[PDB]
């Protein structure tokens, strides 16, 4: 269900997640969604680590260019965490439905470098 391009970096105690754009989203009903991107820093059992982009209206290829920021973690701590990224449609007459997501263990990243990559959305 499409792919998201992210820039991931770390400086001054802060994980920076730049959500750039998404391509080729699909809806079951065939109407254009109103995507926004939401992330949680797992583990999280009470949802206290949410971040959200703004809504992008009526498009299967949103551009956000939006920084989501997690301050106050050491690199050693982040290596125990997973970035859970979800794409959702903001809807006024029905539930905000899921369009795909991806979960990125932070142990996979060189946090001394900026990592710009596409990621496949799955269900």
User: What are the extents of the domains in the chain?
Assistant: 1-123
Structure determined via: X-ray
Distance CA 2, CA 7 (A): 17
Architecture of domain 1-123: Sandwich (2.60)
Distance CA 52, CA 35 (A): 11
Tell me, in Å, the resolution of the deposited structure. Answer: 2.4
Distance CA 105, CA 92 (A): 33
Residues contacting 107, CB < 8 A, separation 6+: 79, 80
Q: CB pairs under 8 A, 24+ apart, for 53-60?
A: 53/19, 55/90, 58/32, 58/33, 58/34, 59/32, 59/33, 59/35, 60/2, 60/24, 60/25, 60/26, 60/27, 60/32, 60/33
98-112 burial, b at 16+ Cβ within 10 Å, e below that, comes to ebbbbebebeebebe
Q: What is the DSSP letter of 13?
A: T
Distance CA 16, CA 98 (A): 24
């Amino acid at each position: 269900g499409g792919a998201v391009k992210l820039s991931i970096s770390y400086r001054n105690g802060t994980l920076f997640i730049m959500v750039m754009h998404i391509k080729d989203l699909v809806t079951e009903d065939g109407a254009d969604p109103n995507p926004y991107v939401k992330t949680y820093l797992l583990p999280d059992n009470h949802k206290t680590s949410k971040r959200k982009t703004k809504i992008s209206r009526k498009t299967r290829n949103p551009t956000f260019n939006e920084m989501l920021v997690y301050s106050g973690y050491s690199k050693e701590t982040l290596r125990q965490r997973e970035l859970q990224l979800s794409v959702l449609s903001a809807e006024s007459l029905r539930g905000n439905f899921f369009l795909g997501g991806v979960t990125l263990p932070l142990k996979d990243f060189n946090l001394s470098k900026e990592t710009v990559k596409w990621y496949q959305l799955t269900a």
